[PDB]
Ligand SMILES: *CC(=O)[C@H](Cc1ccccc1)NS(=O)(=O)c1ccc(C)cc1
């Protein structure tokens with residue numbers, strides 16, 4: 001007769017808990033670049049969690065930092081999908 | 094040429110961040126009861142994130158606490174799927 | 187009718203819903219925070235992407251912590267009855283569980299609480315999506331060669 | 333060959349992999365923790381469920397914080413070359429980011445770090461699943477009538 005007040009929320013984090021989130025001053029953030037690209041290509045074809053999984057793979061494989069500062073050089077990033085959804089989500093019908 | 098060291102991890106939490114996790118002394122925890130039920134019914138049919146979404150719905154809709162203590166009475170729970178996976182996961186092939 | 191399975195959210199309401207994009211680039215000196223160059227690229231990319239998904243996009247730039255809370259509160263008070271979902275994108279500096287306004291922090295929980303199933307009834311049972319582009323700490327992933 | 337798409341993990345290795353189930357029911361008095369009645373039901377349900385998915389299940393009961401760390405370390409040092417994935421289920425008391433051994437806490441990060449892509453090479457590129465049945469705080473969800 002009731003549902004949790006925290007149900008039906010989806011948090012698409014650009015990075016893993018406790019981690020830095022990378023951005024490119026020219027192309028934008030790694031995560032948003034990838035998210036928009038995957039939505040444009042798959043929003044009329046795949047369920048949302050599967051689109052976000054493609055985003056995870058794109059960010060994880062196609063990006064790596066370049067810095068004159070060794071501390072921030074050659075770093076990687078993995079986004080973090082946090083789902084409290086109770087149903088599959090398709091942007092189309 | 095590299096992937097994140099945090100990539101390819103999936104954390105299936107029984108409850109939302111900061112929340113209590115419910116268990117029934119006789120039937121087991123709400124989350125594990127539901128997870129096993131959904132795996133038994135859908136592991137040879139659905140991708141893992143979709144199975145876990147069914148688990149979210151089952152826990153969210155079919156369970157509610159009963160307690161003589163008003164503080165812990167009539168409470169609900171929503172599991173929390175945290176995915177750093179880079180590909181779809183099927184238990185079958 | 188025939189067998190009915192409710193495995194997917196109803197996304198055929200008259201409107202897909204709102205897509206609120208908060209883009210913070212410039213921060214107050216006292217915060218000691220530096221600017222976020224290139225964030226406008228993200229804001230524009232998101233606006234176009236969600237426009238094509240038929241979302242009513244609303245872009246906001248350089249909002250203080252007070253303005254972010256006010257905005258979220260007001261949005262949660264709107265009547266979303268004819269909307270299928272809700273989307274909020276946050277572009278800013280951050281820490282674990284925190285997103286920064288131009289003049290200070292905002293706990294993500296404070297923002298999302300306005301949309302809880304019991305506080306925003308016209309969104310109860312509908313997907314509420316929060317897309318967060320912000321740091322969640324200082325850790326750096328060294329990666330591993332494959 | 334024809335078009336090859338790598339959208340799903342390769343799960344046809346000779347073995348599906350290990351499924352480590354840590355079931356903590358009894359806690360040391362000094363911890364002030366009470367017992368977790370009915371947790372054996374979960375342990376048995378999981379053992380059967382993963383057995384049917386062809387996982388090599390290993391059940392462990394009432395492990396101290398030292399034993400949990402030792403176990404995870406040893407498991408991460410095994411050769412998982414012929415295994416498709418790894419599964420670890422934790423059943424115990426907990427707090428945000430913490431799982432309890434019978435005599436004290438264990439940071440979840442300490443457990444999962446043993447399996448990082450750079451620390452467990454035979455699992456690099458393979459799905460590592462952690463199923464956590466434990467509290468993540470004290471908050472109670474009052475729910476909302478639908
Ligand atoms: C990644 C990130 O946003 C911050 C950069 C920042 C944010 C706000 C104000 C100044 C600088 N980097 S961080 O390494 O995650 C970090 C830096 C400084 C503090 C006090 C916390 C976190």
Ligand SMILES: *CC(=O)[C@H](Cc1ccccc1)NS(=O)(=O)c1ccc(C)cc1
Pocket residue numbers: 112113114363364365366424425426427432466467468469470471
């Ligand atoms: C839900 C949960 O596991 C705990 C119960 C507990 C755990 C360990 C030791 C004693 C009792 N409940 S809680 O409300 O999340 C909680 C209770 C007490 C502390 C100090 C933290 C959290």
